Amino acid sequence: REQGKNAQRNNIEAAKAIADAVRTTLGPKGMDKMLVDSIGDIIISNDGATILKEMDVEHPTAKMIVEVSKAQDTAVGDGTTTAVVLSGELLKQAETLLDQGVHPTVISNGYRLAVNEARKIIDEIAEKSTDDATLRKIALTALSGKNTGLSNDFLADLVVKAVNAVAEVRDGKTIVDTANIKVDKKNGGSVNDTQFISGIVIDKEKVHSKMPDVVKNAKIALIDSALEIKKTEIEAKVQISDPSKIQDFLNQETNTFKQMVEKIKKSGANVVLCQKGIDDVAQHYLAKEGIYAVRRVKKSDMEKLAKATGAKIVTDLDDLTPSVLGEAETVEERKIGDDRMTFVMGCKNPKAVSILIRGGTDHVVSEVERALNDAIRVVAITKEDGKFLWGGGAVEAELAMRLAKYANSVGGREQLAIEAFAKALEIIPRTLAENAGIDPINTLIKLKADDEKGRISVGVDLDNNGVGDMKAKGVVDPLRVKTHALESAVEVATMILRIDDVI
Amino acid sequence: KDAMKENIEAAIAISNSVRSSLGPRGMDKMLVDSLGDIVITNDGVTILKEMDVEHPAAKMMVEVSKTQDSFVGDGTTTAVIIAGGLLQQAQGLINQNVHPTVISEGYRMASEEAKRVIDEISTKIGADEKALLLKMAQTSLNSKSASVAKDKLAEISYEAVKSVAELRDGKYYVDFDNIQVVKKQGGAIDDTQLINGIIVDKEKVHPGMPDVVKDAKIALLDAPLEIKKPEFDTNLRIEDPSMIQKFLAQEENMLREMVDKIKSVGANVVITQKGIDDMAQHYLSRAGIYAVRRVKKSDMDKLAKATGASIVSTIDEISSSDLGTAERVEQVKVGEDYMTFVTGCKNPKAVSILVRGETEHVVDEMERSITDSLHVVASALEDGAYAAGGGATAAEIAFRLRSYAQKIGGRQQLAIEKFADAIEEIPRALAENAGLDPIDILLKLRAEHAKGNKTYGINVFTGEIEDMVKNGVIEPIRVGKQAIESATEAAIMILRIDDVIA
Amino acid sequence: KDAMKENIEAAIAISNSVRSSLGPRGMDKMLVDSLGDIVITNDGVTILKEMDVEHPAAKMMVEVSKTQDSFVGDGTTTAVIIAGGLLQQAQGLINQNVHPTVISEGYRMASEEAKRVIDEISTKIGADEKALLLKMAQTSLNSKSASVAKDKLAEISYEAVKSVAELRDGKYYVDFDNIQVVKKQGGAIDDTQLINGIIVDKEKVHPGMPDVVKDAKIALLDAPLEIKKPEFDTNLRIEDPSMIQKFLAQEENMLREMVDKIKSVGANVVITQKGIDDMAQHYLSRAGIYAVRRVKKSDMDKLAKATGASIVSTIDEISSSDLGTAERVEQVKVGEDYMTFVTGCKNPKAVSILVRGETEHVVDEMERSITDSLHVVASALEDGAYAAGGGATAAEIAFRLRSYAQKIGGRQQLAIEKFADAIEEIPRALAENAGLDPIDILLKLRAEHAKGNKTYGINVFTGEIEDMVKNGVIEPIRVGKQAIESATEAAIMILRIDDVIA
Ligand SMILES: Nc1ncnc2c1ncn2[C@@H]1O[C@H](COP(=O)(O)OP(=O)(O)O)[C@@H](O)[C@H]1O
Ligand SMILES: Nc1ncnc2c1ncn2[C@@H]1O[C@H](COP(=O)(O)OP(=O)(O)O)[C@@H](O)[C@H]1O
Ligand SMILES: Nc1ncnc2c1ncn2[C@@H]1O[C@H](COP(=O)(O)OP(=O)(O)O)[C@@H](O)[C@H]1O
Ligand SMILES: [Mg+2]
Ligand SMILES: [Mg+2]
Ligand SMILES: [Mg+2]
Known part of the structure; x- marks a missing residue:
């Protein structure tokens, strides 16, 4: 147990530490x-969460700072x-106000004032735009400090395209359900070989060799149950008194599988995607019928597939009517890498696409996937919000300048508190610079003045080796991310x- | 000594x-x-x-x-x-x-x-009931970290209790089983809101169930939808290979009939405390029934009071008189998760508060802080x-x-x-x-x-x-x-x- | 904190x-x-x-x-x-x-x-000095186990201080170096008594010294009676067998002469802080001198004040003016032991209290308890x-x-x-x-x-x-x-x- 000063300074020390653990992953450099x-072992990433x-x-305390990354990420x-990094800095900056005598609460109130205020300035200075031109920009920037190769422009484009292909419009506004974008990956070396499939890809093979290698104009039946011999819930036993019956019973089994297949054929379905298993005899006849089947399909997928092709997930094959079958121009198995995968294209519903990620190693594909997700999420948000901000320390520098001014127009203690929040915001520019290997202090000094002269968009220009115009370089931070970052940080800092x- | x-x-x-x-x-x-x-x-x-x-x-x-x-x-x-x-x-x-x-x-x-x-x-408390009670709600919020939004949380605390408060002998009475309070992270504190209805943190049991039902007949069970195995040592004796399918059909029929009963009585939604068999799930789904499962008992009661339902534990006897009522039931995504909102309850003296906090431990205190207000404005009101x-x-x-x-x-x-x-x-x-x-x-x-x-x-x-x-x-x-x-x-x-x- | x-x-x-x-x-x-x-x-x-x-x-x-x-x-x-x-x-x-x-x-x-x-x-303190002071002495004794005899001990405490108390500017002053307090077990508490004089818990250094000397000339030394060996490395060189006795006689003469000096100046008693050589002991004894040795310094001072003596540390220069005076010095057996009582001191403002207690630890507290009274009646008197x-x-x-x-x-x-x-x-x-x-x-x-x-x-x-x-x-x-x-x-x-x- 720790009381007062001990506890507090100690707590700020903890947060600060966990915060530095990720500090060097910030930005491009x-x-x-x-x-x-x-057991699993090595995981190499740049992703904060x-x-x-x-x-x-x-x-x-450190566990609490971790909570915000998981939230920021999922939200x-x-x-x-x-x-x-921001939570670490707000707690750190507060430690001074604390030593001077300011009470934790008034500090908590300053951060409220400050953040609530910043939550307006940004929304005031936010830059609207929904054109692919900038959606592409949001993408490029979301993929920066990550090990994705030189293909970023290619990747950015895939993302913009996928988002646009699934973005729907309702009562006037655009919605982008990121769930309609299925991302997957496969070791095969390339990163450029990353295919954009206008359909749903399933990492599964057809269950039986003789099944059609491809199926055009497919009637797709999604099945909840396993095409296997089922047993009655109430324990049963079979008493054979006549030798003859031993065969008859073995036949019931066969005729059971034959009928399952028959029900399936009768519906018109020529493609069977089964969430559960499929018996070898069922397979025999599905193949004999020429139906393309796939077993143990992931429920997550069973669901996307249902949505993409318009099929209804049926359990009881007795309720397997033509009415509940999905549609796809083609259902074809194709060998992607060492693995064979099932491609479902031409789905009844177009607002469902895939991004089959390629890249080599393994460690490179996982991360590239992680990078492509950040990109997908922000491009999506931006598509909806239509607003964005000037990246690379720009937004922060501005907010800091304005907030330090708003501070004066506030009381004694709270001012001190809001001036503290203003400084905490400068932590980003300083960080981007530090990592780039440039001079934090001067960068900051220069960045302040340019933003002060009204140059909103002057950010930390690693290329120019200092400050520069983010407008030109096209470094743009999506709105929703800034705000949740700020709000999340203040709530947890408090x-x-x-x-x-x-x- | x-x-x-x-x-x-x-x-x-x-x-x-x-x-x-x-x-x-x-x-x-x-x-x-x-x-x-x-x-x-x-x-x-x-x-x-x-x-x-x-x-x-x-x-x-x-x-x-x-x-x-x-x-x-x-x-x-x-x-x-x-x-x-x-x-x-x-x-x-x-x-x-x-x-x-x-x-x-x-x-x-x-x-x-x-x-x-x-x-x-x-x-x-005179005719200033409103601002007096508001002032009370706030002072409570003043000690908690919720102060940040004491103004909004206090209005919500005041609104919520005022709603479920029955003024009987010229005297008020507040049953908290009429105020459902849920906490869901991923939103700022200011995002906390009052939902007329009972929100349940549960999504529909099957991908095929509808996302919304208007004018819902809520069937509330306290029994699972599954085949009932007798109490005596029961065993099936199959001597003819044909019986095997006859038995399997009979078992499916029993489940298909449970659903029929619930459906026949006009049920539109089936909220159960227990489990729903996978096959029974198919049926409800196919019947167009929005069904949730393994629901929290405490919640069960709240849905009851709200919709004027009755918690049936004997499906075979589920009567139409046992059905709750609500203007609409819908699955809504509250941030990350999917929640089921029973809005337009038969009984309007039932409401819900959805506490929003950016972080788990944050929203947790937010939820505690609000409960404190509710108890206050309520206790004040009553006294x-x-x-x-x-x-x-x-x-x-x-x-x-x-x-x-x-x-x-x-x-x-x-x-x-x-x-x-x-x-x-x-x-x-x-x-x-x-x-x-x-x-x-x-x-x-x-x-x-x-x-x-x-x-x-x-x-x-x-x-x-x-x-x-x-x-x-x-x-x-x-x-x-x-x-x-x-x-x-x-x-x-x-x-x-x-x-x-x- | x-x-x-x-x-x-x-x-x-x-x-x-x-x-x-x-x-x-x-x-x-x-x-x-x-x-x-x-x-x-x-x-x-x-x-x-x-x-x-x-x-x-x-x-x-x-x-x-x-x-x-x-x-x-x-x-x-x-x-x-x-x-x-x-x-x-x-x-x-x-x-x-x-x-x-x-x-x-x-x-x-x-x-x-x-x-x-x-x-x-x-x-x-008015003219009731006596009973007032007595009442004080007693209250002190009341807390201690000496209460048993607070009446007698208080009278003794009062008597003792009153005696050594000099009323100078119409104001009193009490020098405790005029009140010798000794404790000897083997007697009841009530047996504690006041002895006009300075009692020393020391008996005569040799069996042959007298048990009593009347009108004593007290010689007080702060040096031992022994042959003085030079400060330089001194060695005797005997080359003639005859010298051996001449040297031994000379050494005895030196001691026999120390005694002569003390005697010649009219000393009757020789109380020394240090030791007395065995041969010197013979001489004093033979001269009829009552001599005690290895006496306590604190005691030395008390005997000085009492008898008006001077503590000589240079025997060779012991002058008649250096002699203390007392009406009589005598060895008395105080229970088991033999004590030396110097009674009838030149200075009558000197007295002794002989604390008696049946047991060691008993007489020890008795001695502490009395000192407390003395300090009281004294402090009172002065104030x-x-x-x-x-x-x-x-x-x-x-x-x-x-x-x-x-x-x-x-x-x-x-x-x-x-x-x-x-x-x-x-x-x-x-x-x-x-x-x-x-x-x-x-x-x-x-x-x-x-x-x-x-x-x-x-x-x-x-x-x-x-x-x-x-x-x-x-x-x-x-x-x-x-x-x-x-x-x-x-x-x-x-x-x-x-x-x-x-
Ligand atoms: N090309 C760039 N030039 C300058 N700043 C950039 C660039 N790309 C990203 N940044 C900045 O780096 C910060 C985010 O770094 P990043 O590694 O993506 O971490 P986070 O998890 O917070 O998104 C933002 O301020 C962003 O604008
Ligand atoms: N605005 C205020 N100014 C002064 N005292 C307040 C204020 N608000 C609340 N208090 C006092 O603070 C105490 C409530 O503190 P709190 O931490 O919530 O304790 P409790 O658990 O007993 O409710 C009460 O005595 C209350 O009257
Ligand atoms: N006969 C008595 N009646 C009531 N109180 C007495 C009596 N005698 C002594 N006291 C009180 O007892 C206290 C002395 O107790 P004692 O143990 O000797 O303490 P101290 O060490 O301070 O002298 C004094 O406050 C004194 O006045
Ligand atoms: Mg990023
Ligand atoms: Mg309180
Ligand atoms: Mg006392």
């Missing part, structure tokens, strides 16, 4: 971490590093600030 | 662990159990119910917390602070050979008088009166007890006066926690109250001793009477125990 | 170890050191100087004891009891955020006022005034401090009042120790004193609050002022220390 467990979910955090997709005794 | 000395100290220790959380400059506690579970909160009942206390006296002090929590809902940190006062004071009296029986009587008498005073200095907060009423009771002491004179008087000093613990804590000088504020506090300023408390923000009802810091009368009640009952118990053995 | 809490407690602990020994219903302590040495006593200075205290604060409280003992002689248990009070009280004030500087000033101011009061309520005992004066100072507190108002006032409550420790202890109800006696005590009964104390025998000067319990004013002085200086020191490190 970011680095990666290598986490190794006991990953490096932390996998990290073995022990200190309670907004991008920004996990930022929210962590939580920790009030803890005066940990037991 | 010693057993007592030791007990009193152990007790006072628990008190202090909670003292710093009292008021608007209150601090919070972080609690990490053996399993590594972390609870970062301000709620004294939680801080208490949570901590690992071993000394029996300490457990007894914690017994206080839960009880104050139980009856009223707000004021558990207050009760504890007083119990420590009384004990620390009795510690002095005990040194002067004042018998623990005398101290217990004196404490008892003072207590009685203390509750009288609160009734006296109280104030009936009908309120007392001025900020230590005003405490300083008042302290004032009046010093007089009564002079009346009921003797050794009793020594105990009655100590009881007064102990009640003064609140103003001291409140002041201390902010940064105000306790002894100075306490002296000024006594002055005003002497001069009949029954509502002068500590404005912890300005540091001045102002009018508490004016500045709006007020609390239900019920909170104050119990704290003093629970507090004196602990002090008396610990005070009679002269030996503690195994 | 904690360092203080810990210090205050450690301190208060020492106080309590001594509390039960205060007064006529006081109890005694048994102290067994590491070496197995046992000291069974009531004298608080001894109880304190004896116990094994480690905590630095505890050592500081003990520092009190010795100092009070040093200056006055009676009242060390009193000083300690108050220092604990003040500390225990400051403990309360410290909880209310009263700054230890405020408490220290308040304590300082109260203290000052407390001594004033004692001067005020004091009483000049010239006395205050009423039995807690009367304490209750008085307590009374007057509560007023002054209201005058020097503020936070200072809180400290001044606590100082009052602390002084009240004495009446509480006195009552407690007897069996009287502290809170009841204390209340009645306050009443009378309020009503201006400046001498109402606790008659620990009847349990009534009577007139202390009347019933005769009185004490020198000096005892009271220091106890309050030493007591407040400890409290202030411990009170400023906010951290204790190594």
